[PDB]
């Protein structure tokens with residue numbers, strides 16, 4: 001309806017305005033007039049807004065700009081005129097706007113720049129002239145814009161770069177020269193040396209090719225260039241001559257992504273000894289040779305996601321990676337090889353990578369069915385900490401498969417098709433292991449020695465793996481004294497022994513939802529009820545949802561003094577014994593939704609309700625009498641505990657007089 005002012009910032013966006021407001025407070029610093037129907041900006045209308053530092057008039061229909069406007073606003077730093085109809089500029093236009101740091105002129109249908117319109121902009125940092133119809137980089141006839149750091153000229157009609165067109169930047173230090181989506185066909189000799197210092201050049205979506213890229217790099221020789229981006233530039237092949245001009249530079253970043261790059265010739269990057277970050281993702285490399293990556297001894301990061309050619313099904317055009325292809329990268333720490341069709345891991349695939357700490361091989365192979373005692377031999381001399389092996393259709397893990405990985409901390413084997421018995425010999429050599437993910441696999445059968453060789457383990461995830469023999473004596477988890485997180489959810493488990501978690505005093509998170517443990521907590525269970533939560537003094541989060549519980553023994557939560565969150569929703573509970581929650585002095589969240597609860601009495605819920613933050617007891621068949629709900633309604637009226645959907649989803653069932661009536665509106669005066 002009108003403008004909203006908050007902390008001297010006026011938001012007048014999307015209000016269909018044809019005139020500039022005259023009733024706004026005289027102390028505003030920022031004025032946002034975006035997405036309106038303004039045709040002009042007269043000086044007289046801005047006389048009362050002399051404190052402005054920022055003016056955003058983007059997405060309007062302004063064609064002329066009055067020079068006197070900048071004299072009325074002496075503190076103006078940011079001016080945004082994007083998406084307007086300001087096609088013609090003159091020397092008078094920005095002549096009085098001396099304190100500007102940012103000037104945005106995108107999508108204004110500017111086709112020609114005459115004379116010197118930016119000569120008075122001595123403090124300008126960013127100039128954005130993108131999405132116009134310019135056919136040249138010439139913006140003046142004399143040395144100006146000395147403090148400029150960013151020049152954006154993307155999506156224009158520039159066909160050639162000359163030195164006498166960029167010579168006005170002779171005293172400038174450009175961190176960014178954005179020339180993307182311009183169909184440049186010639187780089188005239190000396191064109192980049194016309195700028196004082198050039199640090200970054202962007203030529204994405206520019207059809208260059210091998211021959212023109214070679215000429216471009218010759219023009220970059222002896223410049224200050226650190227970053228070069230040539231993404232989607234149709235670089236089909238590379239040779240030992242393509243980047244030769246870059247020998248006379250200290251380039252640290254190169255991006256060659258999305259180029260449909262098929263052949264990478266020997267010694268292609270021998271001229272880049274200072275390169276640190278290399279992006280090669282989304283290409284079509286058919287065969288990587290042993291000398292393709294020669295000379296890249298300083299690279300710390302390499303992205304090879306979807307870099308190799310796809311499977312042809314018929315022609316058998318599978319990608320090939322020669323042995324020793326990574327031996328040159330002595331400083332490589334992070335390697336991403338995700339989503340490829342590589343056949344397997346050869347004996348010398350990763351040899352020479354003496355500084356590798358992170359390696360992701362997620363969905364990297366066609367099928368890596370079996371992990372043998374030799375599969376990872378080439379990583380023996382790498383200080384590898386993280387290994388991701390998801391989505392590879394792995395079926396079997398044999399003995400001593402990870403013996404070469406003595407420094408490994410995180411091992412992700414989730415989302416595969418593993419179906420075997422875990423003997424325990426699979427984990428030999430993993431002396432520094434912190435976490436193992438084994439979730440979403442075919443089947444895993446445990447024994448008493450399954451995790452004996454890894455007593456350092458702190459986190460174990462075994463979700464949806466059709467887990468068998470967890471009821472072994474002694475427990476498969478017994479040697480894991482330092483365990484903090486255990487996920488045994490979605491396994492349809494029916495039997496567990498008393499001592500399953502004995503000695504695990506440091507356990508903090510236990511997930512047991514979607515199993516069949518109901519019988520174990522019924523009083524008539526042969527041998528008595530199973531007290532599997534005994535001694536878990538540091539337990540903070542416990543999930544017991546969807547187990548079909550209809551009985552809870554009085555002493556099961558006895559030792560849980562530190563418990564903060566308990567989830568017992570989606571069960572069939574009604575009658576709960578007195579003092580079942582008596583030792584829960586740290587409870588902050590209680591969930592008992594979609595159960596069969598009729599009575600909510602003090603002798604049960606009193607200690608649990610004391611200092612709660614959240615409560616969820618929605619969708620229960622509440623009994624609306626005095627002996628069943630009086631205390632609960634009295635608690636609801638005076639508590640600060642957040643109870644979501646209280647008015648709508650907390651209804652009475654029995655007696656038929658109160659059927660469908662909210663429990664919040666009950667009368668306690670009769671009790």
Ligand SMILES: *[C@@H]1O[C@H](CO)[C@@H](O[C@@H]2O[C@H](CO)[C@@H](O[C@@H]3O[C@H](CO[C@@H]4O[C@H](CO)[C@@H](O)[C@H](O)[C@@H]4O)[C@@H](O)[C@H](O[C@H]4O[C@H](CO)[C@@H](O)[C@H](O)[C@@H]4O)[C@@H]3O)[C@H](O)[C@H]2NC(C)=O)[C@H](O)[C@H]1NC(C)=O
Pocket residue numbers: 338360362388389390412
């Ligand atoms: C091994 O390598 C694989 C492959 O790279 C990694 O897999 C990625 O794992 C992460 C984490 O599990 C995945 O991200 C999660 O994606 C979920 C997808 O659902 C999205 O929902 C939103 C709407 O909310 C939509 O906008 C999206 O389009 C998706 O449909 C997403 O639900 C989830 O959100 C999480 O947000 C925060 C985390 O910031 C959590 O607190 C919250 O609970 C919630 O779970 C994640 O973003 C990712 O999709 C996986 N990538 C692929 C391609 O599979 C493994 O993680 C790697 N292993 C390790 C240990 O690093």
Ligand SMILES: *[C@@H]1O[C@H](CO)[C@@H](O[C@@H]2O[C@H](CO)[C@@H](O[C@@H]3O[C@H](CO)[C@@H](O)[C@H](O)[C@@H]3O)[C@H](O)[C@H]2NC(C)=O)[C@H](O)[C@H]1NC(C)=O
Pocket residue numbers: 240241267
């Ligand atoms: C870039 O790679 C090319 C390979 O395609 C290199 O060119 C090849 O250079 C070798 C010498 O190092 C040439 O071999 C020599 O040929 C002469 C004449 O026949 C012979 O007398 C020598 O005994 C030797 O065999 C080879 O012919 C040549 N290949 C070509 C271009 O035909 C080139 O040197 C590399 N450039 C650099 C140094 O980056």
Ligand SMILES: *[C@@H]1O[C@H](CO[C@@H]2O[C@@H](C)[C@@H](O)[C@@H](O)[C@@H]2O)[C@@H](O[C@@H]2O[C@H](CO)[C@@H](O)[C@H](O)[C@H]2NC(C)=O)[C@H](O)[C@H]1NC(C)=O
Pocket residue numbers: 455456482
């Ligand atoms: C089990 O853990 C103890 C204690 O580890 C410390 O606390 C953890 C929560 C985590 O923060 C670790 O980084 C801490 O070191 C380990 O005992 C320590 O062992 C190391 C090496 O021998 C050494 O610092 C001390 O001897 C111990 N320090 C303490 C806290 O007593 C123990 O080694 C772990 N069990 C394993 C890995 O088998």
Ligand SMILES: *[C@@H]1O[C@H](CO)[C@@H](O[C@@H]2O[C@H](CO)[C@@H](O)[C@H](O)[C@H]2NC(C)=O)[C@H](O)[C@H]1NC(C)=O
Pocket residue numbers: 018019020040041042044045
């Ligand atoms: C700047 O403010 C002036 C008011 O001083 C606006 O001019 C008036 O515009 C209305 C509506 O078009 C006319 O009815 C008046 O005759 C104009 N002058 C008078 C007497 O106030 C002007 O439109 C404003 N500029 C914009 C477009 O923001």
Ligand SMILES: *[C@@H]1O[C@H](CO)[C@@H](O[C@@H]2O[C@H](CO)[C@@H](O)[C@H](O)[C@H]2NC(C)=O)[C@H](O)[C@H]1NC(C)=O
Pocket residue numbers: 007008025027028
């Ligand atoms: C910015 O303008 C606002 C609005 O005029 C000023 O806030 C007013 O401050 C006086 C105190 O002298 C109050 O009596 C008014 O009620 C305030 N107006 C409202 C409703 O916001 C503010 O002082 C000016 N400068 C700032 C932000 O310090």
Ligand SMILES: *[C@@H]1O[C@H](CO)[C@@H](O[C@@H]2O[C@H](CO)[C@@H](O)[C@H](O)[C@H]2NC(C)=O)[C@H](O)[C@H]1NC(C)=O
Pocket residue numbers: 222223224248249250
């Ligand atoms: C690449 O970086 C090196 C520095 O490691 C630059 O060489 C130095 O340049 C400064 C200033 O010109 C001299 O004072 C040093 O003596 C040079 N160090 C030596 C001996 O190499 C080199 O100029 C940079 N390359 C480019 C083209 O800028």
Ligand SMILES: *[C@@H]1O[C@H](CO)[C@@H](O[C@@H]2O[C@H](CO)[C@@H](O)[C@H](O)[C@H]2NC(C)=O)[C@H](O)[C@H]1NC(C)=O
Pocket residue numbers: 199200226227253277
């Ligand atoms: C040159 O390119 C590098 C790319 O490595 C830029 O540095 C990254 O900048 C992004 C900003 O989005 C950060 O998220 C990364 O963490 C940076 N990488 C690292 C580790 O430095 C850099 O900004 C570019 N320009 C410069 C400073 O030369």
Ligand SMILES: *[C@@H]1O[C@H](CO)[C@@H](O[C@@H]2O[C@H](CO)[C@@H](O)[C@H](O)[C@H]2NC(C)=O)[C@H](O)[C@H]1NC(C)=O
Pocket residue numbers: 265266289290291
């Ligand atoms: C890239 O250079 C390597 C040199 O390391 C070439 O590999 C040689 O291939 C021939 C047969 O084609 C063998 O006889 C040599 O033994 C190989 N060299 C060694 C010692 O590895 C490779 O052919 C070149 N790739 C191409 C074809 O461009």
Ligand SMILES: *[C@@H]1O[C@H](CO)[C@@H](O[C@H]2O[C@H](CO)[C@@H](O)[C@H](O)[C@H]2NC(C)=O)[C@H](O)[C@H]1NC(C)=O
Pocket residue numbers: 610611
């Ligand atoms: C937990 O919740 C209780 C119940 O509201 C808090 O009650 C005590 O502190 C209140 C605020 O300081 C006092 O107004 C109450 O009188 C007092 N209750 C009594 C008599 O014990 C309690 O502070 C919360 N946290 C604590 C300290 O356990």
Ligand SMILES: *[C@@H]1O[C@H](CO)[C@@H](O)[C@H](O)[C@H]1NC(C)=O
Pocket residue numbers: 143146170171
């Ligand atoms: C550019 O820098 C040179 C060297 O410091 C200086 O002599 C010259 O005056 C500068 N150009 C101008 C006028 O900005």
Ligand SMILES: OC[C@H]1O[C@H](O)[C@H](O)[C@@H](O)[C@@H]1O
Pocket residue numbers: 390412413414415437438439440461
């Ligand atoms: O979603 C978090 C985790 O879920 C499973 O454990 C996956 O195997 C793992 O890769 C993922 O990071």
Ligand SMILES: OC[C@H]1O[C@H](O)[C@H](O)[C@@H](O)[C@@H]1O
Pocket residue numbers: 528531555556558
């Ligand atoms: O199972 C025998 C005993 O196990 C635990 O100590 C229970 O807290 C206790 O009530 C029970 O009698």
